[PDB]
């Protein structure tokens, strides 16, 4: 149960820019990353208000989750190297800090770094290359929009790979980024809008397949929506139950559920299409019967049969509906008969 020290300083902006520079240099923070990102997030989102920050929801949720904080008052600080005493790889990291040139500085504040980080979120969990490409294209789109101009230093590959590695390895940053993106979405700032946009784009990253399969296992009808009768079949029952359980264990996570795979929450591991072959197959069958095809669902050769049946089933369901529809309208028995005859004719 890791404890994250949070520091308190008179001048934040300096500490922040000096962190931004350290990340630009590409230092491998390990323990204190959390604290520095905490500072960035404080400065940008919570305006340095430590009370407001510590009272805000995110903190309470995270404390409730497990990673707890503690204040440390350090007013007299200019360089960064002095805020790191915790021995580990500190001399190595220090070498890397001392190695940095103090001369140059890039015009970029927390918000920009945090939005730039946010850019990674959506495709992050897919694959380094995909995520980077996504980031690039989204930057090109944001520059096309004229929503923001990022430093051409950052658009380097290595940098993006470092930040990517950081986002992949660290949780806090993502949790705060997304929390800002969704929960507290006030203010008139651009960075906030970019974050909110990226986070809105990230929703259900890594679950879309499962989600769609579910969409197909569901069924619309005059009496609202219902679970698709096929799925109620006997031989799938256990799979449906385990699925239900999994889906509950996900749902329990509330508003953060769509970001369950990014954050890697508790139950999320138990929801992959491969874990639910029969259901997947059925869903695909239904889809195929309706005409559309379902993405990212390779079906097992034993289940090919199942799917291939499910298609037929769904088609027969669909057909049957028609004659029940006719009934409802207003007509003569013979007219109904002829119409049904016409259904059977058009269908074959």
């Amino acid at each position: 149960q890791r404890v994250i020290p949070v520091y308190q300083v008179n001048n934040l902006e300096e500490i922040c820019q000096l962190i931004i520079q350290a990340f630009e240099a590409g230092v491998d923070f390990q323990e204190s990353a959390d604290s520095f990102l905490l500072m960035l997030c404080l400065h940008h989102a919570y305006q340095g208000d430590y009370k407001l920050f510590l009272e805000s929801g995110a903190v309470k949720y995270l404390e409730g989750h497990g990673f707890r904080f503690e204040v440390k008052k350090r007013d007299g600080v200019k360089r960064l190297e002095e805020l790191l005493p915790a021995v580990s790889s500190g001399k190595n990291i220090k070498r890397t800090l001392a190695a940095m040139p103090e001369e140059e500085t890039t015009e970029a504040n927390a918000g920009q770094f945090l939005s730039f980080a946010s850019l990674f979120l959506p495709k992050l969990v897919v694959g380094e290359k995909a995520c980077l490409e996504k980031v690039q294209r989204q930057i090109q789109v944001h520059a096309e929009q004229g929503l923001i101009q990022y430093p051409t230093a950052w658009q380097s590959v290595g940098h993006m790979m470092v930040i990517f590695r950081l986002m992949r390895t660290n949780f806090l940053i993502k949790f705060l980024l997304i929390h800002q993106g969704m929960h507290m979405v006030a203010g008139h700032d651009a960075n906030d809008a970019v974050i909110s946009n990226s986070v809105a784009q990230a929703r259900f990253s890594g679950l879309l397949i499962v989600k769609t399969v579910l969409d197909h296992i569901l069924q619309k009808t005059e009496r609202g929506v219902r679970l698709h009768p096929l799925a109620r079949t006997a031989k799938v029952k256990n799979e449906v139950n385990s699925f239900k359980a999994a889906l509950s264990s996900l749902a329990k996570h509330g508003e953060y559920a769509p970001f369950a795979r990014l954050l890697n929450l508790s139950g999320v591991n138990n929801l992959e299409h491969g874990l639910f072959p029969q259901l997947s197959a059925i869903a695909l069958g239904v889809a195929t019967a309706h005409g559309s095809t379902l993405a990212g669902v390779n079906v097992g050769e034993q289940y090919q049969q199942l799917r291939e049946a499910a298609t037929e089933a769904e088609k027969q369901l669909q057909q049957y509906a028609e004659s029940r529809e006719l009934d409802h309208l207003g007509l003569d028995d013979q007219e109904k008969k002829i119409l049904m005859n016409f259904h059977q004719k058009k269908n074959e």
């Binding site: 259900f204 679950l207 579910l214 929506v225 698709h228 239900k244 369901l317």
Partner: peptide, 28 residues
């Protein structure tokens, strides 16, 4: 006419927990 809920809305509701799964998953 009956068909699969392609809009996602409901899936989203269930996965969010805005609708309890059991409201759809009912064995009796």
């Amino acid at each position: 006419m009956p068909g699969p809920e392609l809009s996602g809305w409901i899936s989203e509701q269930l996965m969010t927990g805005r609708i309890p799964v059991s409201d759809i998953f009912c064995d009796i």
